[PDB]
Design a protein around this nucleic acid. Structure first.
Ligand SMILES: [Mg+2]
Ligand SMILES: [Mg+2]
Ligand SMILES: [Mg+2]
Ligand SMILES: [Mg+2]
Ligand SMILES: [Mg+2]
Ligand SMILES: [Mg+2]
Ligand SMILES: [Mg+2]
Ligand SMILES: [Mg+2]
Ligand SMILES: [Mg+2]
Ligand SMILES: [Mg+2]
Ligand SMILES: [Mg+2]
Ligand SMILES: [Mg+2]
Ligand SMILES: [Mg+2]
Ligand SMILES: [Mg+2]
Ligand SMILES: [Mg+2]
Ligand SMILES: [Mg+2]
Ligand SMILES: [Mg+2]
Ligand SMILES: [Mg+2]
Ligand SMILES: [Mg+2]
Ligand SMILES: [Mg+2]
Ligand SMILES: [Mg+2]
Ligand SMILES: [Mg+2]
Ligand SMILES: [Mg+2]
Ligand SMILES: [Mg+2]
Ligand SMILES: [Mg+2]
Ligand SMILES: [Mg+2]
Ligand SMILES: [Mg+2]
Ligand SMILES: [Mg+2]
Ligand SMILES: [Mg+2]
Ligand SMILES: [Mg+2]
Ligand SMILES: [Mg+2]
Ligand SMILES: [Mg+2]
Ligand SMILES: [Mg+2]
Ligand SMILES: [Mg+2]
Ligand SMILES: [Mg+2]
Ligand SMILES: [Mg+2]
Ligand SMILES: [Mg+2]
Ligand SMILES: [Mg+2]
Ligand SMILES: [Mg+2]
Ligand SMILES: [Mg+2]
Ligand SMILES: [Mg+2]
Ligand SMILES: [Mg+2]
Ligand SMILES: [Mg+2]
Ligand SMILES: [Mg+2]
Ligand SMILES: [Mg+2]
Ligand SMILES: [Mg+2]
Ligand SMILES: [Mg+2]
Ligand SMILES: [Mg+2]
Ligand SMILES: [Mg+2]
Ligand SMILES: [Mg+2]
Ligand SMILES: [Mg+2]
Ligand SMILES: [Mg+2]
Ligand SMILES: [Mg+2]
Ligand SMILES: [Mg+2]
Ligand SMILES: [Mg+2]
Ligand SMILES: [Mg+2]
Ligand SMILES: [Mg+2]
Ligand SMILES: [Mg+2]
Ligand SMILES: [Mg+2]
Ligand SMILES: [Mg+2]
Ligand SMILES: [Mg+2]
Ligand SMILES: [Mg+2]
Ligand SMILES: [Mg+2]
Ligand SMILES: [Mg+2]
Ligand SMILES: [Mg+2]
Ligand SMILES: [Mg+2]
Ligand SMILES: [Mg+2]
Ligand SMILES: [Mg+2]
Ligand SMILES: [Mg+2]
Ligand SMILES: [Mg+2]
Ligand SMILES: [Mg+2]
Ligand SMILES: [Mg+2]
Ligand SMILES: [Mg+2]
Ligand SMILES: [Mg+2]
Ligand SMILES: [Mg+2]
Ligand SMILES: [Mg+2]
Ligand SMILES: [Mg+2]
Ligand SMILES: [Mg+2]
Lengths: 109, 177, 135, 132, 72
RNA sequence: UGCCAGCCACCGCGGUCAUACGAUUAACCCAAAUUAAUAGAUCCACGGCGUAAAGAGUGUUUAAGAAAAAAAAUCACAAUAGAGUUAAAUUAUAACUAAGCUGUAAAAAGCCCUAGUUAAAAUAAAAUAACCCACGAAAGUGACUCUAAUAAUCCUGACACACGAUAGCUAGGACCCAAACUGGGAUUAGAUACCCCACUAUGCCUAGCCCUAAACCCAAAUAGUUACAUAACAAAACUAUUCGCCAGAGUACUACUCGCAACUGCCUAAAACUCAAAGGACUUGGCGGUGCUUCACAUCCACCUAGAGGAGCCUGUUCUAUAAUCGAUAAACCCCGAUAGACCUUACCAACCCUUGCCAAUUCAGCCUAUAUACCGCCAUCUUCAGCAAACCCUAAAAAGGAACAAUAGUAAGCACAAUCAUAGCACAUAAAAACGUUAGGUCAAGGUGUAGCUUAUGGGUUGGAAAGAAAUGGGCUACA
């Protein structure tokens, strides 16, 4: 605006980033509650294998399992990361495949 | 028009008056130009839309061995020449307006177009007309028949003299050889 | 080809410069003639802008003191009984005579309008012109 | 919209034979008949045979003379002999042309059990009636 | 056009008024409920001062009027 | 594999032929590292505020600032606040007179203590003048008169101060007429609405609150300039001094706070979450129970004739029934492919049978099997509609547009229409023709094909068998004399 205004208001500061689902950490350890299924948003349709998990942050969170096929039993321990899934509403947490109770999605050779 | 403000002399009771000194200075240069083109054996195209004078301007031009276009002006005429006129064609070397307007009081296309084509243009601006695209203007009255006639016969004569002088210098060229 | 841009600059500019870039391989006629005798102003394109605000024109209206007299003449008699001709370059009207008489009675050193006007009227009466005398 | 034996308007660049440019309703008005024989007149017999026969000679000439055929093939039947005229494009070296002349005449004559006469009129390029 | 912004507002307002009608008395509670907190916090605010300024009692002639609950 | 399994950082990919999935095959690029994740560095606005997010409802002053010269002239008269007054109309209420009066597209209800006329206070509201453009800071102000009266030797300025349309609230008056609500009456599937009829809060005054508007001329104040200059549209573009305001869209004139004579209020005004948009202006279409003109010539209306819907029968669909075809199925199906099924046709069902099984040769034949949303063929349809389209040319930019004949940027061969042909001479009439596209319109059962499937069978033969009517309906025929 004017100079006195730009003086009184200071220069603009770049606002600190809002921490996401992982609350700033790269990954999270988690424990399974109930394996289940969700339906995608409109233009595309499927059914995605989801879990409900608890995080070492003591928060419960809905997360996504990548790949075709898996074994996920209650009380299994998992690792999770912050990939958001573009199909579904509100699932912000992927499960890392290959660690703990989820082994690398199997090969059919 | 707003671009006549310099060429004007002043308002006499609401009617505007051109500066005749400037008229002569300009017209001299215009006629000189016209001539030097004629001598160099090139096309000259008179143009007017103005009805009163149509006949004059053709009757003038036909007698100069110069061409007139006094008529409706088809659109792509100079711009798209080879399609309109013929498979390949020569274009006017100089275009000369005895009025700068069309009967709807806009600038004649030929102005925009000549100017578009790198053709020089010699024309009579009037107090309402826009001079700025015309190569050599002559500020002056386009409307009164004494004026049209005058300008006609003058461009006529400049042409004729250029042509004669051409012939002569050609004969001298032929004796020198 | 060439350059068809009507706004960019004068035809002289474009042509000279396109030859300068050796695109146009043939010097055109009017070009050389032009170089020889250029016109007053380059034929450059200008938007015809409207005038806003306080801007007026530069034209000077046209008036003579002769006119300040003629005003009074037409104020009395009207347009001359001899009518007018715009074909005849030397035509003098009733008005013009009046102006001349008034100029000579001004060189006779009379500052009063009544005297100047009326006596000039007497000069034209002596010249046999009919002064209608309208109120 | 009648699609019968017609050639559609292109972007305007498509070359067209005089025949293929004249639509079915035009037969006997501008266009002529590609074949001639007695069989369809009022009191006449065996029209069918000359039709099968004709068809087979269309296919036969298209197949014996590859890529060199110009316009559709003109059959005439006169007093038991066939007169087969063809517009043929010049592709082949002339030897091959006469090889196939003899070949055709003989073969057909012995097939239809009637004497065949063959005529090739050679043309530099397909005649263009329209567009191009 | 810009009506399409106004439509939203129009709706959101209408849908709000309707709400505040059904919910009226629930609302009325929670308003007064907080006014009784206000007046109390206010009180404590001043109480804090006696106790901070060393006085035992509230100073002479202090009834500490109720501003927030003012009615009629 | 077939909107499934799955993938994507953004746009997105998977619905039978996926370079987006999973796996191969080639490549690409990094490389003792490579990807993924999460944090940073970097990243707004010395840009804006008519239509896009943003000039506060209004003025004055404080704080704080900015400063050459000129900068108080008058209402063309409707600021405000008082006090007084009334011309038109309307209403009480009488006098006559007639039975109706009111009310709509049409009615009904309603009222006849109604209606017309003649009289006539209060209350309320102020034709024409106004085609004027004044006065106020804004809200606002236009019947009449008188009183009081319109800040500042004139720059900007708030959360401070004083005002602020309607509606609303409190108390008291007023009440002609209007009128939310409500009750009747119609309309309607419904009609809590639009139309009708009553009647109320309320508009009115006096005093006190409330403080909101599309409070918008969506355009801040004060000095300037018309130079430079067209995003678009609208009211043409900009300096200089200031203050106020704007950092995606919702969420949200919202939740919590603070303050207020408000206590379904006003003001100030977030986040979680969700999305990859949300917005402004424009461009061609299409559409319009918008407006205007001009038509319809078997054609909408008005008109004329002869029929369909009823009856019997013929024949086609649709349903039920059958072991027992397929296709068409708004206009553009329904005596339709059929100018045609007793066997045949024949594709169907039932049983039996035959496996280089038509041909010159072929790990080859043969398939009325799935794709008409892969197609060519032939057509329907707008359509007796006038447009389609290359090659160019123009437009202070072009998505696109491109005419005016006392002509203003259009030229253009082509295909359409038109013209000619046919109906044995004319003419008209009919026939024919009728592009580009549209309907993923029709048809893999005329034939042919792309992709898929079948191969001792989805192939090829022999023998029989089908096409019954509870009905429902389309078109015909014959009648009713
Ligand atoms: Mg991911
Ligand atoms: Mg047809
Ligand atoms: Mg909403
Ligand atoms: Mg609360
Ligand atoms: Mg499924
Ligand atoms: Mg595949
Ligand atoms: Mg990719
Ligand atoms: Mg892949
Ligand atoms: Mg490393
Ligand atoms: Mg930057
Ligand atoms: Mg702007
Ligand atoms: Mg806005
Ligand atoms: Mg915002
Ligand atoms: Mg404002
Ligand atoms: Mg303010
Ligand atoms: Mg507001
Ligand atoms: Mg000070
Ligand atoms: Mg200053
Ligand atoms: Mg009062
Ligand atoms: Mg009265
Ligand atoms: Mg009365
Ligand atoms: Mg009355
Ligand atoms: Mg009515
Ligand atoms: Mg009644
Ligand atoms: Mg009025
Ligand atoms: Mg006004
Ligand atoms: Mg003042
Ligand atoms: Mg001030
Ligand atoms: Mg108010
Ligand atoms: Mg009120
Ligand atoms: Mg009342
Ligand atoms: Mg009363
Ligand atoms: Mg009433
Ligand atoms: Mg009701
Ligand atoms: Mg209805
Ligand atoms: Mg209505
Ligand atoms: Mg009442
Ligand atoms: Mg009022
Ligand atoms: Mg207003
Ligand atoms: Mg407005
Ligand atoms: Mg505003
Ligand atoms: Mg301000
Ligand atoms: Mg001021
Ligand atoms: Mg300036
Ligand atoms: Mg534009
Ligand atoms: Mg936001
Ligand atoms: Mg509000
Ligand atoms: Mg609120
Ligand atoms: Mg506050
Ligand atoms: Mg009819
Ligand atoms: Mg019709
Ligand atoms: Mg009947
Ligand atoms: Mg019947
Ligand atoms: Mg059937
Ligand atoms: Mg059945
Ligand atoms: Mg079917
Ligand atoms: Mg079908
Ligand atoms: Mg159909
Ligand atoms: Mg029929
Ligand atoms: Mg049978
Ligand atoms: Mg079969
Ligand atoms: Mg199907
Ligand atoms: Mg189709
Ligand atoms: Mg097809
Ligand atoms: Mg046409
Ligand atoms: Mg075009
Ligand atoms: Mg004829
Ligand atoms: Mg005809
Ligand atoms: Mg026809
Ligand atoms: Mg025709
Ligand atoms: Mg279909
Ligand atoms: Mg259909
Ligand atoms: Mg087939
Ligand atoms: Mg095939
Ligand atoms: Mg069999
Ligand atoms: Mg059988
Ligand atoms: Mg029936
Ligand atoms: Mg009958």
């Amino acid at each position: 605006a004017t100079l006195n205004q730009m003086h009184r208001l200071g220069p603009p500061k770049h606002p600190p980033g809002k921490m996401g689902p992982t609350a700033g950490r790269p990954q999270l350890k988690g424990v399974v509650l109930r394996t289940f299924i969700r339906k995608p948003k409109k233009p595309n349709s499927a059914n995605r294998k989801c879990c409900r998990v608890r995080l070492s942050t003591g928060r419960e969170a809905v997360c996504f399992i990548p790949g075709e096929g898996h074994s996920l039993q209650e009380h299994h321990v998992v690792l999770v990361q912050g990939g958001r899934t573009q199909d579904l509403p509100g699932v912000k947490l992927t499960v890392v495949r290959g660690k703990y109770d989820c082994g690398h999605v199997q090969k059919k050779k | 028009h707003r671009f006549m403000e310099p060429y004007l002399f002043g308002s006499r009771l609401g009617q505007d008056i051109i500066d005749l000194e400037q008229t002569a200075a300009h017209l001299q240069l215009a006629l000189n130009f016209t001539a030097h083109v004629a001598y160099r054996e090139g096309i000259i195209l008179f143009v007017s839309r103005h009805r009163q004078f149509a006949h004059l301007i053709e009757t003038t031009a036909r007698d100069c061995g110069e061409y007139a276009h006094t008529r409706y002006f088809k659109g792509g005429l100079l711009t798209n020449a080879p399609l309109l006129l013929g498979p390949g064609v020569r274009l006017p070397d100089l275009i000369i307006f005895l009025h700068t307007l069309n009967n709807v009081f806009e600038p004649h296309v030929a102005v925009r177009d000549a100017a578009k084509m790198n053709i020089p243009t010699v024309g009579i601006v009037d107090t309402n007309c826009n001079p700025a695209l015309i190569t050599y203007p002559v500020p002056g009255n386009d409307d009164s028949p004494p004026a049209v006639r005058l300008f006609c016969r003058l461009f006529q004569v400049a042409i004729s003299r250029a042509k004669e002088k051409r012939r002569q210098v050609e004969a001298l060229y032929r004796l020198q050889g | 080809a060439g350059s068809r841009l009507e706004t960019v600059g004068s035809i002289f500019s474009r042509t000279r410069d396109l030859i300068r870039a050796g695109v146009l391989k043939e010097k055109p006629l009017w070009l050389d003639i032009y170089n020889a005798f250029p016109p007053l102003r380059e034929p450059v394109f200008r938007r015809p802008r409207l005038r806003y605000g306080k801007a007026k024109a530069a034209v000077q209206d046209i008036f003579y003191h002769e006119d300040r007299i003629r005003a009074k003449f037409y104020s009395a008699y009207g347009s001359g009984p001899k009518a007018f001709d715009l074909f005849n370059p030397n035509f003098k009207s009733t008005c013009q005579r009046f102006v001349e008489k008034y100029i000579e009675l001004q060189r006779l050193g009379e500052t009063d309008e009544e005297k100047l006007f009326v006596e000039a009227g007497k000069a034209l009466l002596a010249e046999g012109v009919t002064l209608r005398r309208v109120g | 919209k009648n699609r019968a034996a017609r050639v559609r308007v292109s972007k305007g660049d498509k070359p067209v034979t005089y025949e293929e440019a004249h639509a079915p309703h035009y037969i006997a008005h501008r266009k002529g008949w590609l074949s001639l024989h007695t069989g369809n007149l009022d009191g006449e017999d065996h029209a069918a045979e000359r039709t099968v026969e004709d068809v087979f000679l269309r296919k036969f000439m298209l197949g014996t003379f590859p890529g060199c055929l110009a316009d559709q093939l003109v059959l005439k039947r006169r007093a038991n002999q066939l007169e087969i005229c063809a517009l043929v494009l010049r592709q082949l070296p002339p030897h091959k042309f006469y090889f196939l002349v003899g070949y055709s005449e003989t073969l057909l004559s012995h097939f239809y059990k009637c004497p065949v006469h063959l005529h090739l009129q050679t043309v530099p390029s397909k005649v263009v009636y329209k567009y191009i | 056009k810009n009506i399409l912004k106004i439509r939203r507002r129009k709706m959101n307002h209408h849908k709000y008024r309707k709400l505040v009608k059904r919910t009226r008395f629930l609302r009325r509670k929670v308003r007064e409920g907080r006014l009784r907190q206000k007046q109390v916090k206010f009180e404590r605010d001043l109480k804090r001062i006696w106790q901070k300024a060393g006085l035992k009692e509230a100073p002479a002639g202090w009834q500490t009027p109720k501003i927030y609950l003012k009615n009629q």
